[PDB]
Amino acid sequence: YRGNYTDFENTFQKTVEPVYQMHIKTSKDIAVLRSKEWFQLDDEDFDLLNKTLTFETETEVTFKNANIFSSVKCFGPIKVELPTKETVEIGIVDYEAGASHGNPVVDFLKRNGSTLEQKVNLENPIPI
Amino acid sequence: LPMSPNHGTFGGDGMYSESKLSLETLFNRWHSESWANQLTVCGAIIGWTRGANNIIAEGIEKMGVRTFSQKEMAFNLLGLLTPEVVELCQKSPVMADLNGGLQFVPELKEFTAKLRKELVETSEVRKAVSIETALEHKVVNGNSADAAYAQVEIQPRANIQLDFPELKPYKQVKQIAPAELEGLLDLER
Amino acid sequence: DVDPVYKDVAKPTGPKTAIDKNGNITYSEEPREKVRKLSQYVQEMALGGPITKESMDVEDALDKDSTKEVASLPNKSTISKTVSSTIPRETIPFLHLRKKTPAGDWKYDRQLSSLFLDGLEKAAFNGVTFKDKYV
């Protein structure tokens, strides 16, 4: 729909964020994850060390403008890959705020965590 | 003689360890050679002095040992020139230990290295967590919350004054001169 | 006509390392809570510590009234009983002289060390002099 859309009330973003992982090889970096209030744990003593957590992140966001968000909704369970390759929901993401400019959760997992699928490219693309 | 308790304990200090240890054969040389009547030896084992290592000084002291300021240590060594010890060293070579009971902490290298690691680690963690919470905050609440949080500085420009004499209120200058001076001096002369 | 005396009055300091929120390690020489002159310093040295265990109080006006303290400089304090008395049994002080044994090693001797600390205390109170001493 082309034109100008003063549609700040009728707007909403409801995207299913990529399942990032994060490997906890070291103790200075589990301390970084624990500093983040959004990482709610079911067993708050659960030794995360030497594990691969995954994040079923899905982010809703209201907009008040074409850039600044009106409210940020980050929720979704947090699993741990077990050695037997049967995960379990050990935590919840729950990030709530007002005047947001970007999801910090997704921003966090963008740099500190990693995308499951990373497409590799050729040195030279094949002209089919 | 400034002999240390550090005899290949800490290491990584070239021949410092063999230089201070060898200074300690002067005790047997003072009996076995002629020069006893000319020189007397008052070998001082110099303990942990502050003024690198100064950070962990607190840490090591928590073991019930004493480290010294330069002043303290200098007071201790001047102690070794009081007429009482001078007579004493003349009678036979004095061996003073100003180590502050540091000789009793076992594995001093390993215990020092443990203390540096624990203080450095915590210093770098809090540095990293503090900067990573600062860039997260700036992402969430934009650069506009941090440009209005930034303050404009003012840099001083030279204002070269001619420095005329400071003129007091008449009441104050009338006190310093005697009151009888008024209209006494010809001001042409 | 009295000899010039090395007497220090400087406030003894200890080490205080603090890590702020932003992980900056700051070092500082901080007034020792207990030790607040040289006499006290020598008494702390005399007592030693728990790990050094093998097997007197004076009123002043330092950091409150300079003038009275100046007044009590040329008045040389007589000691009731020396700090060498207050060295605990089977306790090696922090400052101590050694003696060579007949066996051919250096062990802690109580008598010499007792004499050394007495010296120290006397310097702390009255002050040592070095008149006509070439160094």
Side-chain angles (χ1 to χ4, degrees):
Chain A
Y1 292 152
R2 177 169 299 100
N4 277 338
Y5 298 90
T6 315
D7 220 52
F8 308 121
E9 299 308 80
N10 311 342
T11 194
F12 80 101
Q13 178 248 323
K14 202 252 182 188
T15 63
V16 178
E17 294 302 298
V19 174
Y20 303 101
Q21 58 174 357
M22 60 174 279
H23 325 87
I24 300 150
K25 303 284 96 186
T26 80
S27 52
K28 46 164 283 166
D29 309 337
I30 191 185
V32 163
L33 182 65
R34 181 159 264 287
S35 80
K36 295 313 200 243
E37 300 102 57
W38 45 261
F39 201 105
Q40 273 83 221
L41 274 162
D42 303 307
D43 176 45
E44 57 198 284
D45 306 339
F46 185 79
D47 184 14
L48 292 163
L49 184 55
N50 313 325
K51 304 293 183 68
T52 299
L53 300 183
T54 61
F55 281 56
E56 190 164 24
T57 306
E58 50 277 356
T59 202
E60 190 270 306
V61 160
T62 64
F63 308 67
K64 67 174 75 75
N65 294 139
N67 40 357
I68 295 99
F69 305 149
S70 169
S71 185
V72 61
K73 188 70 64 181
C74 204
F75 54 71
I78 313 153
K79 288 174 183 175
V80 60
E81 185 179 342
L82 285 178
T84 56
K85 202 181 183 178
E86 58 200 32
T87 54
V88 59
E89 289 163 358
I90 60 162
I92 301 293
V93 181
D94 204 75
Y95 184 73
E96 312 302 325
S100 338
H101 292 235
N103 222 323
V105 180
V106 177
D107 167 48
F108 193 95
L109 277 57
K110 263 166 187 152
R111 300 166 284 91
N112 305 292
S114 57
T115 45
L116 290 176
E117 291 281 9
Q118 204 271 304
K119 64 209 70 66
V120 54
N121 298 325
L122 278 80
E123 70 179 28
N124 309 357
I126 298 165
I128 289 167
Chain B
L1 303 167
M3 307 162 306
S4 64
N6 311 151
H7 298 329
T9 303
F10 286 83
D13 49 4
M15 278 193 286
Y16 177 83
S17 303
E18 191 63 21
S19 304
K20 300 309 191 149
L21 184 53
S22 281
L23 277 167
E24 200 169 354
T25 86
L26 290 177
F27 294 130
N28 298 341
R29 287 180 79 91
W30 184 93
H31 288 122
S32 54
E33 299 229 328
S34 47
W35 48 265
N37 316 306
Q38 280 70 50
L39 315 170
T40 63
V41 179
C42 169
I45 316 160
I46 318 307
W48 193 295
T49 312
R50 310 183 306 274
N53 316 144
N54 310 115
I55 46 166
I56 49 169
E58 186 171 357
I60 191 67
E61 281 201 357
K62 295 321 182 222
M63 296 276 295
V65 71
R66 192 61 153 72
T67 72
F68 313 86
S69 74
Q70 289 181 61
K71 211 77 201 83
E72 277 161 352
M73 188 45 95
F75 165 80
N76 294 340
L77 286 167
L78 287 163
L80 292 171
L81 286 177
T82 189
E84 308 314 317
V85 297
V86 164
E87 299 154 345
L88 206 63
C89 79
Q90 288 196 32
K91 292 172 185 79
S92 164
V94 171
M95 170 58 154
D97 184 12
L98 317 185
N99 205 6
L102 190 48
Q103 59 264 23
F104 295 107
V105 182
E107 286 79 40
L108 182 60
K109 178 172 182 180
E110 279 64 63
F111 184 79
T112 284
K114 180 178 185 177
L115 277 186
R116 276 212 212 73
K117 164 162 55 52
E118 282 173 298
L119 296 198
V120 167
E121 196 191 67
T122 297
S123 170
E124 297 208 3
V125 161
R126 282 190 206 189
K127 245 192 192 183
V129 173
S130 176
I131 193 62
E132 202 284 331
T133 49
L135 62 87
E136 168 184 44
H137 162 86
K138 192 155 210 180
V139 163
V140 163
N141 308 280
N143 309 341
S144 64
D146 291 327
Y149 175 59
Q151 291 72 26
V152 170
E153 307 193 286
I154 288 304
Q155 293 290 25
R157 309 184 97 96
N159 188 202
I160 300 156
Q161 292 307 321
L162 294 196
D163 284 286
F164 281 46
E166 194 179 314
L167 283 160
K168 296 160 161 183
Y170 183 70
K171 194 46 60 202
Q172 287 182 53
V173 297
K174 199 57 184 173
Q175 290 155 17
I176 70 161
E180 308 77 67
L181 192 60
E182 209 194 307
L184 180 54
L185 309 197
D186 174 9
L187 297 162
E188 276 184 279
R189 303 300 294 254
Chain C
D1 306 334
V2 177
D3 305 348
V5 298
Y6 159 62
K7 177 174 175 177
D8 186 18
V9 290
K11 207 200 300 189
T13 53
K16 286 301 300 302
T17 194
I19 313 172
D20 53 0
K21 296 313 194 52
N22 320 135
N24 312 311
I25 51 171
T26 300
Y27 176 60
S28 46
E29 305 275 19
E30 283 299 326
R32 288 228 175 254
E33 180 197 310
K34 180 47 57 186
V35 181
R36 62 185 283 278
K37 45 166 177 283
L38 274 298
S39 70
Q40 285 196 33
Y41 164 86
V42 179
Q43 296 192 107
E44 185 194 21
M45 309 329 294
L47 298 195
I51 194 171
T52 70
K53 284 143 207 159
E54 92 290 1
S55 191
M56 303 263 110
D57 219 10
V58 172
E59 284 290 319
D60 55 289
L62 278 86
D63 301 306
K64 39 195 72 69
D65 193 327
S66 297
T67 310
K68 189 262 285 171
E69 269 304 307
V70 166
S72 60
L73 289 176
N75 302 133
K76 297 297 96 177
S77 77
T78 50
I79 315 306
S80 300
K81 186 58 61 181
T82 58
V83 69
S84 49
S85 74
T86 82
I87 304 165
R89 313 311 319 290
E90 297 191 65
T91 308
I92 304 177
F94 289 141
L95 308 182
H96 70 260
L97 307 190
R98 307 216 185 115
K99 180 209 290 300
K100 194 187 172 66
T101 74
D105 66 275
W106 296 91
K107 75 168 287 295
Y108 157 65
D109 182 277
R110 187 168 199 285
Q111 190 59 268
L112 312 187
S113 307
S114 283
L115 185 133
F116 175 45
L117 266 63
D118 294 330
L120 281 183
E121 179 193 6
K122 269 174 67 215
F125 277 100
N126 292 359
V128 62
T129 190
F130 307 122
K131 187 193 50 53
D132 283 305
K133 188 174 292 295
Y134 297 73
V135 300

